[PDB]
Structure 1
Amino acid sequence: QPKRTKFRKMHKGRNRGLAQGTDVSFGSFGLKAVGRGRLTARQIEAARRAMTRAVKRQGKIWIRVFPDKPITEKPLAVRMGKGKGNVEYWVALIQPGKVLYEMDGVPEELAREAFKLAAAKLPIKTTFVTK
């Protein structure tokens, strides 16, 4: 699927947004996912809102990858109208070795349980990384 964006027509809005956590200090942690895959904005919200709703203990939870690749669909016959932007909103491109969610935290992992809850929402076997 040739990477896409817009410069076309305006579609729906972002189901995501709340970056959460404080960004006064930049860290280098994360949660890598072995395997490339396209994740829609919605599923990203469910996973993000899953951990954020569990890491009430603190914060410093952040995400680097965001959906920037639109995908249109077409319901009915066919013969006039390339594609409209429906349920299929922006989608993020994840690399075989890309870090998605990283939380600035020293060995006190209380979010591993949160990342686990989210790891069951995105279609891809993710693994927990300390580095």
Structure 2
Amino acid sequence: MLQPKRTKFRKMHKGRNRGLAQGTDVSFGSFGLKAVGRGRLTARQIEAARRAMTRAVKRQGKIWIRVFPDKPITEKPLAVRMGKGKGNVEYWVALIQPGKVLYEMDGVPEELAREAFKLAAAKLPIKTTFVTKTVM
């Protein structure tokens, strides 16, 4: 899921992935799944980690998804040559920089949150870490 309902433009440039992430703090919840390493987080991987989390916590507590797949990724079909325009939009990713809190959790004990975050981290491609809400 998690494809945007509308877009201003259908396709984007490929671009490059940024230096460091905005949104490093745990804001809404009490525990978080912070990102250690770059990559692009596909909407399918985001949904799979969300299901692993939600079933691990048995649909108790509240889960925030702090990233959104707003970048369309185009892929050329099989056995077509180079050129002839840009390819068709196939799937949506979120660009992840180190330090991006990907998910947030509240209303659960910390060890159950760690187990749910571990089961989500097993589905995500990038390396993640467990973070806790800190006052500054």
TM above 0.5, yes or no, is: yes
Where does structure 2 lack aligned partners over 5 or more consecutive residues? none
2:45, 2:124 within 8 Å by CA — same for their partners in 1?
Answer: yes
Deviations 1:78-116 (A, max 9, x none): 468756776841101112111011112475441211110
Distance across 1 between alignment mates of 2:15 and 2:44:
11
Distance across 1 between alignment mates of 2:21 and 2:98:
23
1:34, 1:125 within 8 Å by CA — same for their partners in 2?
Answer: yes
Distance across 2 between alignment mates of 1:91 and 1:68:
6
Distance across 2 between alignment mates of 1:60 and 1:19:
24
Distance across 1 between alignment mates of 2:21 and 2:58:
15
2:69, 2:93 within 8 Å by CA — same for their partners in 1?
Answer: yes
In the superposition, relative to structure 1, how do residues 92 and 19 fare at CA in structure 2: closer, same or farther (>3 Å)?
Answer: closer
Distance across 2 between alignment mates of 1:14 and 1:55:
36
Moved more, 63-72 or 13-22: 13-22
2:71, 2:94 within 8 Å by CA — same for their partners in 1?
Answer: yes
Q: Does 1:116 align with 2:118?
A: yes
User: Which structure has more strand as a fraction of its residues?
Assistant: 2
In the superposition, relative to structure 1, how do residues 89 and 121 fare at CA in structure 2: closer, same or farther (>3 Å)?
Answer: same
Moved more, 21-30 or 81-90: 21-30
1:59 aligned residue = 61
1:39, 1:91 within 8 Å by CA — same for their partners in 2?
Answer: yes
**CA RMSD of the aligned region, Å?**
8.0
Distance across 1 between alignment mates of 2:25 and 2:62:
7
User: Between Structure 1 and Structure 2, how many residues are aligned?
Assistant: 131
1:46, CA displacement in angstroms? 0.6
Scaled by the length of structure 1, what TM-score is found?
0.70
Percent of counterpart pairs with the same letter? 100
1:9, CA displacement in angstroms? 7.3
For 1:30, what is the secondary structure of its paired residue? strand
In the superposition, relative to structure 1, how do residues 106 and 41 fare at CA in structure 2: closer, same or farther (>3 Å)?
Answer: closer
Deviations 1:21-74 (A, max 9, x none): 999994454211111210111111111110101111622111110100011111
Distance across 2 between alignment mates of 1:12 and 1:89:
13
1:16, CA displacement in angstroms? 24
